[PDB]
Amino acid sequence: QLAIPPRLYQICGWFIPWLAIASVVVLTVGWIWGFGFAPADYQQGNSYRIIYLHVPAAIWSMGIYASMAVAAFIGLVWQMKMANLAVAAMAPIGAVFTFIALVTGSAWGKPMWGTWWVWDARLTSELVLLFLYVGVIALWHAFDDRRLAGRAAGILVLIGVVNLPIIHYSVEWWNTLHQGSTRMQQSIDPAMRSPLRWSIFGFLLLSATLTLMRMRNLILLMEKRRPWVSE
Amino acid sequence: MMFWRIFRLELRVAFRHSAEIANPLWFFLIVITLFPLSIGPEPQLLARIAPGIIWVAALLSSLLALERLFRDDLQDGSLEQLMLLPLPLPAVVLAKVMAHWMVTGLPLLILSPLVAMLLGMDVYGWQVMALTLLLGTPTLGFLGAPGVALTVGLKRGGVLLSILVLPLTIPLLIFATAAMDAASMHLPVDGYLAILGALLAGTATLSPFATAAALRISIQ
Amino acid sequence: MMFWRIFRLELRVAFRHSAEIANPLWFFLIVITLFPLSIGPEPQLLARIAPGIIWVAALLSSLLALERLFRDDLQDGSLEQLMLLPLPLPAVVLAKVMAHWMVTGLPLLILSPLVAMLLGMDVYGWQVMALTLLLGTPTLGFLGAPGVALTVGLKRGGVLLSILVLPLTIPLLIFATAAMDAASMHLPVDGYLAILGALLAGTATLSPFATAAALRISIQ
Amino acid sequence: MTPAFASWNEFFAMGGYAFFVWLAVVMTVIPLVVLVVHSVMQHRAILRGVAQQRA
Amino acid sequence: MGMLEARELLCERDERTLFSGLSFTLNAGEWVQITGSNGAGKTTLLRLLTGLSRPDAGEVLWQGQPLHQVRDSYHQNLLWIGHQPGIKTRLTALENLHFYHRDGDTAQCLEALAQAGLAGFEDIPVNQLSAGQQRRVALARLWLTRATLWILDEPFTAIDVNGVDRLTQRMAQHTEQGGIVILTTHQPLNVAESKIRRISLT
Amino acid sequence: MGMLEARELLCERDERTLFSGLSFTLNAGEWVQITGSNGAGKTTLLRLLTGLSRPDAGEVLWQGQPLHQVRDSYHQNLLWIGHQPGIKTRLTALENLHFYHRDGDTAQCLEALAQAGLAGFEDIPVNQLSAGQQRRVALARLWLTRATLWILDEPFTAIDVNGVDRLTQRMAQHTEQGGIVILTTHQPLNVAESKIRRISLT
Ligand SMILES: [Mg+2]
Ligand SMILES: [Mg+2]
């Protein structure tokens, strides 16, 4: 059931087409049944719609770094070389999602804040998340020899996952110290959650397709000196 | 091969590496001195910004000093420690970290009365600053040990090591500044020191093992 | 020979891949954001301590890069750029330092539009923050090279060699951090900026020779 | 059959905050397309490099 | 019932199989030279044997147990001197040998230095010593340690032709009593070739 | 009239006089070996000759002119490889020889890396390579360079017999045309001692 040969390339090759064909039919129902059919709120008017671009890009900004924790735990204690590569396969995608979350938060707060950049808990947390992703990516693109950069990235990812709750719950209180209040109340309205659940599920599928595509590129980036790639 | 022998050896080596263990102290002093003159003679603004700038300078000085935790040993005697000294590698890393703190954290802690006097901090403010430096710089060493252990073979110095180690020090910095700012109006500050002692224990009972694995990866 | 070939060599050894070009940018972003977490999210307060923040970041980057300027070369290849390469040793040093700037000044120059608004400075807080981080950042490397040469090259050196790298930068930081103050009050810097040009023209002419002499004394 | 909007791009694409919404849309679409194209171009460039090595 | 062994060792550098299916046993009193060219993974094999590196396939069996179970009863009987000597080149010559000795020190460390060839260069910083005398600081440990397994990686780097006849006269006694020495040298060994068991990376 | 003619050199490192009154002349077409022991100033004489160091007394007189004066028409006629190879430990060997070449051809560099012995190692970073091969990378700059003066410090440090023979053959064509080579090696040279002038470090 798990004897991973260099068939992972041929295993996640049948699943990239249909997980990309069906990852755009779920996004264009999470972005067309919203963004044009969901009524707008009172306080923000027709701007309470960057939810679909910021919330799915923030849930899966930390939902992939918690998926690189498993991709580093399995690749460390069981000492698997292939699974360890997953740590290096989901890092650029997580970094892009964090950057998108920052951009969307900045564009969503500008109507209300008055300036593009203010330091908030839900925003500084994503900023430090981007910093950790950048650390992972920079560490991976530093070793000249592979099979060592992967393990170093796994160790760093484990350390960052250990530190993540502490950092998040420290920023959540640092916000309470100075500002002392929260900006928006936790409410989504009933006929705005299904169009947002659709978008979250679509962003889940796009990330899976992207990480499969990046994994197919990283397998050939380490096994390029074997006769298996004669084809 | 014993723990104390390694500690004394590293203390002896660090002293002959002078003019490089004193650069972080000079950076600390320059950063502490620059801001009071940049903003001019303003009592309230300087008094409000001192708790933050002090710890920012301390963190930057610790980061500057961390570059030599394992770098020099890699070109020669980074082995003879994994390969010998049946004392477990986490214990060797612990000795390294304690020696580094003795060479870096203790010098920062020892001039605290002078820094407090220069910045106008009262006796209570100095007490809180010393108590948070005693529980803060060992945390810096334990947090920066894995980063320098991973980076030692890379010798991509400065930017990379900072990118690895600085984000991990966010709670320490935040709680240290909160603790000192709680001493500005002289309200009691003990709950903010518990969150520092617990974090110090957590980073002292989990970093040596992570740093051991990082060193094992780097050596190979 | 081929001064430009030495410059290209240092650039190549600085960035092995195209994904490490952004590492200084991320380092500077981390250093910049390290301050508000300690001082607070106040926009009006961060608009006055901004010169200190950015110049502390620049000084930290310059210090971090001065180690890989000379120390790494000293172990294996540093007598080759002196013995070989029949162009004069000053010109051999110059290339290195002008690569150093392109690792510590160009990333900060590019990030200048971003960090001039993250902190909260105006448009005139970027015109003179660009023609102060371009007119003075190379000077940092120029006057830090002679001190670093002796510090990391001369064997059997005391603590008295620590006053040759950092303290001479202070009169630069005295001017630069006091130049953008004229931007805070929205007044023309002019003279306090035109005197940094004299520093650049008097330190880009005598620092390469001093560094060549320092290397000659160190190896001898 | 019946939207929450009313009419063409005088009504749609302009909710009063058009610049912010269509800037968030732009900076969400562009990085994702960049990632997709980057992955495809590497998946082809690896084979090009292999063909280069086959000499 | 042999001592430190191998179990089908194999290592890959991602372009060549340096050695595949290595299986050799070392009983007590063996002089072993790792024969090979300048491209073979002799250094990698030695690091695999010391436990610093992890084999890609197969394990190394010391006394019956792998090197991850008994990693404290094995480091006691060990002496590895790699290409890098492993001495902090800021301390004096004697201060380095003071770190590697358990007890009865400052009276045999100077004796070890005298027997190594560094007579008079004791209280001199290592960085002030020549490139061939820096190796002698590390090689002086052969007269101090009580280890029963010497894994020497290129012991003869810059040693003068006088010193070599003392190294391959102390080693011929260590391997004579109960020791095991694992050499990897390119210079021919002066001692008779009817003794050294040469094994090639197969 | 005549190449390097260091007259009355004097060195007093630490508390010992390494050499006093060492006045020797090097004519054109000279193979010379500095004979001493492990601890003598054989590494200091080779650094008093390249101008890296300065004599305590006397001067080295290249081509009849003081070495510190010209220092521009002499660094193009000099090739010194010391104990440390001098190659960056991150770049590939091809990039290193691309640097050290005076033309930057990437076609003669491949020929040099195929004559030294590193056939197939022109894209592996030198740190990932072996220890002898790192020295062979630096010693590969003997077919590229057209400098008629070689000062080699410990050339045969970690190189196998075949590489040693290749290097000894390479230096056997240099020193008749116009070449001049200075060695300090603890391994006896396979060439007959009738073509080597031995200078005793008195
Ligand atoms: Mg070797
Ligand atoms: Mg020597």
Numbering used by the authors:
A (entry chain C): 7 to 237
B (entry chain F), C (entry chain B): 1 to 220
D (entry chain D): 1 to 55
E (entry chain E), F (entry chain A): -1 to 200
Study authors write:
The cytochrome c maturation system I, consisting of eight membrane proteins (CcmABCDEFGH), results in the attachment of heme to cysteine residues of cytochrome c proteins. CcmABCD represents an ABC transporter complex using the energy of ATP hydrolysis for the transfer of heme from one binding partner (CcmC) to another (CcmE). Our cryo-EM structures reveal that CcmA2B2 form a homodimer which is an ABC transporter analog. CcmC which harbors the heme-binding site is attached to two CcmBs with two coupling helices TM4 and TM5 on CcmC, respectively.
Three-dimensional classification in cryo-EM studies reveals two major states of apoCcmABCD and CcmABCD in complex with ATP and heme, and one state of CcmABCD complexed with AMP-PNP. In one of the apoCcmABCD conformations, each CcmA binds one inorganic phosphate and the two CcmABs tightly contact to form a “full-closed” conformation. In the closed-NBD state of apoCcmABCD bound with inorganic phosphates, N36A is H-bonded with the phosphate, and A156A, G130A in the other CcmA (right zoomed in panel). For WT CcmABCD, the protein changes to open-NBD state to break these H-bonds and release the phosphate for the next cycle. Superposition of each of the closed NBD states of CcmABCD indicate nearly identical structures (e.g., with two ATPs or two inorganic phosphates or two AMP-PNPs). Our structures also reveal substantial conformational changes upon binding of ATP (to CcmA) and heme (to CcmC): closed NBD conformation when bound with two inorganic phosphates, two ATPs or two AMP-PNPs; open NBD conformation when it is ligand-free; and semi-open NBD when bound with one ATP.
